[PDB]
Ligand binder design. Sequence first.
Ligand SMILES: Cc1cc2nc3c(=O)[nH]c(=O)nc-3n(C[C@H](O)[C@H](O)[C@H](O)COP(=O)(O)OP(=O)(O)OC[C@H]3O[C@@H](n4cnc5c(N)ncnc54)[C@H](O)[C@@H]3O)c2cc1C
Ligand SMILES: Cc1cc2nc3c(=O)[nH]c(=O)nc-3n(C[C@H](O)[C@H](O)[C@H](O)COP(=O)(O)OP(=O)(O)OC[C@H]3O[C@@H](n4cnc5c(N)ncnc54)[C@H](O)[C@@H]3O)c2cc1C
Lengths: 487, 491
Amino acid sequence: LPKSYDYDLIIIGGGSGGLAAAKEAAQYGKKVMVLDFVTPTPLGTRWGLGGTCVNVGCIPKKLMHQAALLGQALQDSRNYGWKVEETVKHDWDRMIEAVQNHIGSLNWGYRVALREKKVVYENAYGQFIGPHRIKATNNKGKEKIYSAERFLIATGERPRYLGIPGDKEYCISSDDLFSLPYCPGKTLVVGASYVALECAGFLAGIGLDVTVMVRSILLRGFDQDMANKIGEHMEEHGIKFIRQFVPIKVEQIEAGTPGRLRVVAQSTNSEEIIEGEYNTVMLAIGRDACTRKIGLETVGVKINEKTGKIPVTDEEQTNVPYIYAIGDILEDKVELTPVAIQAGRLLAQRLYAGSTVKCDYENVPTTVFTPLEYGACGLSEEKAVEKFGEENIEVYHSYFWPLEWTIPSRDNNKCYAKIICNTKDNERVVGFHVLGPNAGEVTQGFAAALKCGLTKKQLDSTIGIHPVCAEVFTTLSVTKRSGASIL
Amino acid sequence: KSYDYDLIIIGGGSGGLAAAKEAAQYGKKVMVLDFVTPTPLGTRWGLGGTCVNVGCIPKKLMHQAALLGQALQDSRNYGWKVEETVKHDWDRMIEAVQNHIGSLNWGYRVALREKKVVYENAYGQFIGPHRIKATNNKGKEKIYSAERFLIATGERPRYLGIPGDKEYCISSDDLFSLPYCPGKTLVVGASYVALECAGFLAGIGLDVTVMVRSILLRGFDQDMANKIGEHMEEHGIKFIRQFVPIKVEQIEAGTPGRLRVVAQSTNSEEIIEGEYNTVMLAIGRDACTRKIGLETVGVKINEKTGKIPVTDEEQTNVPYIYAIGDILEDKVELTPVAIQAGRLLAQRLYAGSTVKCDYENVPTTVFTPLEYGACGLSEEKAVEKFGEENIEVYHSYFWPLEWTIPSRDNNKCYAKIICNTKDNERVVGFHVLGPNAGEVTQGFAAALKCGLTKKQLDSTIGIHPVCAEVFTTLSVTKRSGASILQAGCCG
Ligand SMILES: Cc1cc2nc3c(=O)[nH]c(=O)nc-3n(C[C@H](O)[C@H](O)[C@H](O)COP(=O)(O)OP(=O)(O)OC[C@H]3O[C@@H](n4cnc5c(N)ncnc54)[C@H](O)[C@@H]3O)c2cc1C
Ligand SMILES: Cc1cc2nc3c(=O)[nH]c(=O)nc-3n(C[C@H](O)[C@H](O)[C@H](O)COP(=O)(O)OP(=O)(O)OC[C@H]3O[C@@H](n4cnc5c(N)ncnc54)[C@H](O)[C@@H]3O)c2cc1C
């Protein structure tokens, strides 16, 4: 009668948002349970507690990015006086081992964090079966049913495939790459998402022959001027591109570790068809919300059956009152770990602690870890013009050259900076974009500045820090309208 | 009213060249005098100022060489097949650093020619109202008149009045061009210069020691300072605390030679002595305001400190004479600040701008082995100004993803913001000890210019996985008592 459900809250999904909400909730003394299960990849790769970010996302992605940056660091050191050979060899295996070992340490940590906070953790797949009731199936098949006063859906997504011959059977994806047991060799990454380019990037940085087949534009959604510059930088530094082509079939010329596959691709506007041979073929074309097979119908949760995303209120509530959702699965939000975490944390506070602070998904900063990092926050130049009108938007930009690059004598005028201003609003800074080293580190603070209503005037009154990249933003004086060169 | 120039600028450094260029842009006739008086050992350098030749630029570049050494070690675990120990070539480094400086020197000259600014490589001194004498290198003098003057003369490495220093010791001015590897070195003092150089020299593979009179980094937050101290000590750099040297003597000339430093305790009658190959003096700097005939024109300066008191518009007591840069009294001794002032000043005069240079919450970064960025009040200064009870301090440790594979330095990086509870917990102080601290600090500075509040900070989302994000989620205050050991195995 008065709440005798099994738990005050059940969380489907032990990833970024999941674990965040779990911990926050436990802190206010609620009986919480977290179900987390990892469904193997078509090739049978699986991993521990943590979510996408910990095992197959940010964490390992960044670390390999770093291995690539360090190779560059080995070359840069020659001119600064370190006596190193001109060509240093890299060991895939040694790397993966190290990365997987860190991951393992994180898996275990999350497990312990849960135990310590008195949160029950079942490594089982969940699916609702009826109001306030869920079924959990473990790895052996054994099932059990639990009731709970509320539910949080934090299930995340997974690498999408092409419906084409040979993919699930021969191709790998983000899920497999970070634990690959052999050097991928001549690789072909397919798609032009953040993931696509980031991986093509580190793969090239560690010495492999890489090619990237794109269907249309690079980084759809991101500022196109910037994207194109990332493209250009990648192309100038190894990575080869095949533009306007989608593959139609992949066939195994020979199994191995790695083997040899042949990819047959077709033009997206010609009847032209090509074919090439590669050791590995990574599919990085998009990801699919894990919202379909969890029996949402039995409980009444309305999801956009088209996209897979779960519409939700500004408080992360679904149509069904006692069921909430956060994370990648949300519809029209931001598909990033910190967001998932913020939502999870604040939601729990809103329920179990009287907080009334809603997660703010506006001008969420982001960074794409391509060989030349790109950081960003706010409107792209396109989306800015559209929203306020070409006439009311001023664009201040400038190239720049990292002091650290002068001795090695490389890449002058590749790094780029631009802010977007709203003339109708005291030249408010509505867009912040930076292409260059340590882009994430540079962007974080300017994000807190946009949350404060940074004005070009106030920016101009800030003094830069010399000599560091980030200062280029304190002295932007050339506008794009003007016409002046910044080259 | 028939003067030779609309403006004469003494000093072709950071603020000098900035005002020069800005003024020329509004079509005024401008002249810049820049002369470099050698170091007791006779080192000299081109156009540019302290920062270009013997400051920021070469300082950071070497800091970088030290970081790359660490990058070489870090690369092994990420799979790169590198030796355990790589040797460093001092000569090759300096040649490269000096080559960049050179290109910068030339650059600045061309920038002046192109903007139609007259450059005289001569030392200047006022001789009487609106008139100055310029003495070149050979001795030949000339006199010029101008409707207004800008004093942007900067400072120079200060010495100890003690036996053997000017004769056997090097300073920031010499180090960046040193023609030989300094070998076992002893750095005297604990200024940011002191620590930064001790830092890179150690990072490059040298035996380094640091003799300190009292506290490290006087002026900066002490909790932070101490942490840098501790980090340096734990990573090579040796320290001798509470000791000032009393005499330095050459046990044997050479490249480098061998010197013997004799030092006296600062609270005991104890005296010690050690032998070193080089001895760098980094105890402070002196304002170049004394030998420029300021009396002949009436310019009033603080005769004690050497600094020139000035208005909020950078004006001296003498209306047609202005001053910017390190020289100023109670300002901020940083290149970007000199530049801002110089630029804005020229606009105020020659363009009707009414925008004054804002010296409040100027961000800064001490490039020690573990960088330290900062902006606004220190914790100490915040407490004093608003009262212990009204100050809340949010802090946390953090561990760079980049350092996990090489498995090193867990919980060394540290972050802390100071808030004023009486003012919607405004963020009055921002301090971060970790990699790329300048890059991390720059943006939060623009935030403080906007009145960033802890609430607004909390509403900002972090970028993952990046160091700077630790600031978006500070929940532990110092008052509370909670421990902040953030990162063992997880969270
Ligand atoms: C290659 C790659 C790189 C990325 N890089 C970054 C980056 O640098 N920065 C950033 O912010 N974001 C990055 N992301 C995105 C980030 O990983 C996601 O935004 C974040 O992980 C979403 O957290 P989540 O909890 O909502 O989804 P998830 O983290 O994926 O949590 C989902 C968990 O739920 C489990 N699960 C699913 N269904 C069930 C069920 N029915 N029962 C039990 N358990 C279930 C899943 O197996 C999974 O472990 C990256 C993603 C990828 C793929
Ligand atoms: C080792 C070191 C590291 C530093 N690192 C940093 C850093 O990382 N970031 C930062 O912001 N700041 C740094 N600084 C401080 C920065 O260099 C100064 O704040 C800045 O250079 C001051 O510019 P200025 O024009 O006021 O003086 P200066 O730049 O030094 O310009 C002075 C010029 O005037 C010339 N001159 C002097 N008298 C005469 C005369 N009578 N006639 C003709 N010419 C004359 C001098 O030779 C000199 O070239 C550092 C300083 C040092 C010493």
